[PDB]
Amino acid sequence: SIDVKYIGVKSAYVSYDVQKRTIYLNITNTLNITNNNYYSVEVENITAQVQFSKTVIGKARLNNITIIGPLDMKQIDYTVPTVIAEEMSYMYDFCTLISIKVHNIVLMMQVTVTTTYFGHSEQISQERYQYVDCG
Amino acid sequence: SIDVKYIGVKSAYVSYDVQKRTIYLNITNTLNITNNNYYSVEVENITAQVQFSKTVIGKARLNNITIIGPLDMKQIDYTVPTVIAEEMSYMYDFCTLISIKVHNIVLMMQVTVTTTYFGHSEQISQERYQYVDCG
Amino acid sequence: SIDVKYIGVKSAYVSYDVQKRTIYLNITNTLNITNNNYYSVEVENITAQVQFSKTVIGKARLNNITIIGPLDMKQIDYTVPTVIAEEMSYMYDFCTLISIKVHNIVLMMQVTVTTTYFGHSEQISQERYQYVDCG
Amino acid sequence: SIDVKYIGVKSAYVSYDVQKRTIYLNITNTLNITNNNYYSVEVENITAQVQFSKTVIGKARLNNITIIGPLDMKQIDYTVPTVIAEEMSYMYDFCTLISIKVHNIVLMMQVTVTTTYFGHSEQISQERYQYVDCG
Ligand SMILES: *[C@@H]1O[C@H](CO)[C@@H](O)[C@H](O)[C@H]1NC(C)=O
Ligand SMILES: *[C@@H]1O[C@H](CO)[C@@H](O)[C@H](O)[C@H]1NC(C)=O
Ligand SMILES: *[C@@H]1O[C@H](CO)[C@@H](O)[C@H](O)[C@H]1NC(C)=O
Ligand SMILES: *[C@@H]1O[C@H](CO)[C@@H](O)[C@H](O)[C@H]1NC(C)=O
Ligand SMILES: *[C@@H]1O[C@H](CO)[C@@H](O)[C@H](O)[C@H]1NC(C)=O
Ligand SMILES: *[C@@H]1O[C@H](CO)[C@@H](O)[C@H](O)[C@H]1NC(C)=O
Ligand SMILES: *[C@@H]1O[C@H](CO)[C@@H](O)[C@H](O)[C@H]1NC(C)=O
Ligand SMILES: *[C@@H]1O[C@H](CO)[C@@H](O)[C@H](O)[C@H]1NC(C)=O
Ligand SMILES: *[C@@H]1O[C@H](CO)[C@@H](O)[C@H](O)[C@H]1NC(C)=O
Ligand SMILES: *[C@@H]1O[C@H](CO)[C@@H](O)[C@H](O)[C@H]1NC(C)=O
Numbered sequence: 333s334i335d336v337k338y339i340g341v342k343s344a345y346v347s348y349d350v351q352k353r354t355i356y357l358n359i360t361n362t363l364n365i366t367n368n369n370y371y372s373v374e375v376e377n378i379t380a381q382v383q384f385s386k387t388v389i390g391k392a393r394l395n396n397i398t399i400i401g402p403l404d405m406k407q408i409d410y411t412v413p414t415v416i417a418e419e420m421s422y423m424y425d426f427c428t429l430i431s432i433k434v435h436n437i438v439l440m441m442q443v444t445v446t447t448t449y450f451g452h453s454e455q456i457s458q459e460r461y462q463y464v465d466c467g
Numbered sequence: 468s469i470d471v472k473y474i475g476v477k478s479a480y481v482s483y484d485v486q487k488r489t490i491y492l493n494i495t496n497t498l499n500i501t502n503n504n505y506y507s508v509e510v511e512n513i514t515a516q517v518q519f520s521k522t523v524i525g526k527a528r529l530n531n532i533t534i535i536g537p538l539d540m541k542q543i544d545y546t547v548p549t550v551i552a553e554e555m556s557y558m559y560d561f562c563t564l565i566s567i568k569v570h571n572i573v574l575m576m577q578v579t580v581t582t583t584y585f586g587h588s589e590q591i592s593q594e595r596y597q598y599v600d601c602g
Numbered sequence: 603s604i605d606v607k608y609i610g611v612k613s614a615y616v617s618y619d620v621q622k623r624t625i626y627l628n629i630t631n632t633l634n635i636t637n638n639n640y641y642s643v644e645v646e647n648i649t650a651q652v653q654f655s656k657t658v659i660g661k662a663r664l665n666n667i668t669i670i671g672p673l674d675m676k677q678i679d680y681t682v683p684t685v686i687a688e689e690m691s692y693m694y695d696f697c698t699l700i701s702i703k704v705h706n707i708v709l710m711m712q713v714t715v716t717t718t719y720f721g722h723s724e725q726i727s728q729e730r731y732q733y734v735d736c737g
Numbered sequence: 738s739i740d741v742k743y744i745g746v747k748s749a750y751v752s753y754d755v756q757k758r759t760i761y762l763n764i765t766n767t768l769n770i771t772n773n774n775y776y777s778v779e780v781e782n783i784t785a786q787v788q789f790s791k792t793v794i795g796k797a798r799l800n801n802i803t804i805i806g807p808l809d810m811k812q813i814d815y816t817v818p819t820v821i822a823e824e825m826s827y828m829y830d831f832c833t834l835i836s837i838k839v840h841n842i843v844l845m846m847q848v849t850v851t852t853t854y855f856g857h858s859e860q861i862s863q864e865r866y867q868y869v870d871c872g
């Protein structure tokens with residue numbers, strides 16, 4: 333890829349920003365831009381293109397064949413008991429979190445048993461992430 | 468991809484922003500822009516293009532064949548009991564969270580047993596994420 | 603890739619930013635830009651292109667064959683009990699977190715048993731990450 | 738890759754930034770830029786290109802064959818009990834964290850049993866990371 337940018341606050345080509353408590357007086361700003369961009373991206377120039385997938389089974393004897401794809405989960409267990417017993421007591425809870433299997437982003441591409449792929453694949457993630465804020 | 472940008476606050480090409488408590492006086496701003504963009508993206512220039520998938524089964528004997536695709540979940544268990552017993556007691560709870568299997572984004576593409584793919588695939592995620600804010 | 607940038611606060615080509623408590627007086631700014639960009643990225647110039655995958659099974663005898671793809675999870679167990687017993691007691695909790703299996707980003711590409719791939723693959727992640735902030 | 742940059746605060750080509758408590762007076766700034774960039778990246782110039790994968794099974798006898806892909810997890814156990822007993826006692830907790838299996842970023846590419854790959858692969862990660870901040 334081209335021009336993949338994370339900018340926290342502010343982006344510009346030409347900036348004349350003026351901040352608090354300023355005396356901006358008697359200024360002459362002269363700007364003469366010639367900014368040209370020419371892109372040629374993922375361009376195929378092919379006379380003859382042949383792409384294929386072939387699966388042939390002849391005079392075979394197949395018996396007792398097991399295929400299991402990825403991400404197989406079996407006999408998983410989560411046990412998070414919470415017991416609170418109080419007797420003539422004081423208790424104060426502020427900003428208490430019990431998190432089990434919390435997900436923000438899941439991107440899945442070409443998760444298979446068999447794949448044949450011709451071409452371009454991309455995954456882009458940009459974020460600002462903040463889980464707990466309790467001030 | 469081209470020009471994938473995360474900007475937290477502010478974006479511009481030319482900015483003359485003026486902030487609080489300012490004296491902007493007697494200013495001459497002269498701007499002369501020539502900004503041209505020429506894009507040629509994912510362009511195929513092919514005389515002959517042949518693409519195919521072929522699956523042939525001849526004089527075969529298949530018996531007792533099991534195929535299982537991905538993301539198989541079996542015998543999963545979540546146990547999150549909460550017991551609160553009070554006797555002549557005080558209790559204050561503020562901003563209490565029990566989260567089990569919480570998801571924000573799930574993007575799935577080409578999740579299969581068998582795939583044949585010709586071309587372009589993309590996934591883009593941009594976000595600002597904040598789970599808990601209790602001040 | 604080209605031009606993959608993480609900028610924490612501010613980006614520019616030409617900046618004349620002025621900050622707090624300033625006397626900007628009697629300034630002459632003259633700017634003459636010729637900024638051109640020519641990109642030729644992922645460009646195929648091929649007369650003849652032949653790409654294929656072939657799987658042939660002849661006069662074979664297959665028996666008792668097991669294939670298991672990746673990321674297989676079996677007999678996993680999480681046990682996080684919390685017991686609080688109080689008797690004529692004081693207790694104050696602020697900003698308490700129990701986290702089990704917390705995920706922010708999961709990107710999966712070509713997670714398979716068998717793969718044949720022709721071309722370009724990319725994964726880009728940009729972030730600002732902050733788990734706990736309790737001041 | 739080309740031009741992969743991590744910039745903590747500020748980026749520019751030409752900067753005339755002025756900070757707090759300044760007297761910027763009687764300044765003449767003259768800038769004459771000729772900045773051109775020519776890129777030719779991942780460019781194939783091939784007369785004849787032949788790429789393929791072939792798997793042939795003839796007159797073979799296969800029996801009792803087990804293949805297991807990577808990242809196999811079996812009989813994993815986590816035990817994190819927390820017991821608090823109080824009797825005529827004072828207890829104050831601030832900014833307490835129990836973390837089990839916490840993940841920020843997971844990028845997976847070509848995690849398979851068998852792979853044949855022709856071309857370009859890339860993974861880029863840029864971040865600012867902060868786990869706990871409790872002042
Ligand atoms: C600004 O420039 C003009 C022209 O040179 C001049 O007459 C004027 O007095 C100046 N002002 C200040 C505040 O110096
Ligand atoms: C600005 O740019 C153009 C193109 O290069 C040039 O011909 C023109 O004379 C320039 N003008 C000034 C004021 O410098
Ligand atoms: C593309 O292919 C043709 C045939 O070989 C060639 O004559 C032509 O100049 C090429 N053009 C580009 C832009 O590469
Ligand atoms: C601003 O510029 C004009 C023209 O040069 C001048 O007459 C005027 O007095 C200036 N004002 C200040 C506040 O200096
Ligand atoms: C601005 O740009 C054009 C194109 O380059 C140029 O011909 C023109 O003279 C410029 N004008 C000024 C005031 O510089
Ligand atoms: C595309 O293909 C034709 C045939 O080879 C060629 O003559 C032509 O110049 C090409 N054009 C471009 C824009 O690549
Ligand atoms: C700024 O420049 C002008 C022109 O040279 C001059 O007349 C003016 O008095 C200057 N102002 C200050 C504050 O020196
Ligand atoms: C600015 O750039 C153009 C292109 O190089 C040049 O022809 C022009 O004379 C320049 N103008 C000035 C004021 O220097
Ligand atoms: C591409 O291929 C053709 C055929 O060999 C050649 O004549 C042409 O000059 C090439 N063009 C480029 C841009 O590489
Ligand atoms: C700045 O420059 C001008 C021109 O040389 C001059 O007349 C003016 O008095 C100067 N101002 C100061 C503050 O020295």
Ligand SMILES: *[C@@H]1O[C@H](CO)[C@@H](O)[C@H](O)[C@H]1NC(C)=O
Nearest residue numbers: 634635636767768769770771
């Ligand atoms: C700036 O750059 C151009 C291109 O090299 C040159 O022809 C022009 O004379 C320059 N202008 C000045 C003021 O130096």
Ligand SMILES: *[C@@H]1O[C@H](CO)[C@@H](O)[C@H](O)[C@H]1NC(C)=O
Nearest residue numbers: 647649777780781782783784
């Ligand atoms: C690419 O290949 C052709 C054929 O050999 C050659 O004539 C041409 O000059 C090449 N062009 C480039 C840009 O390498």
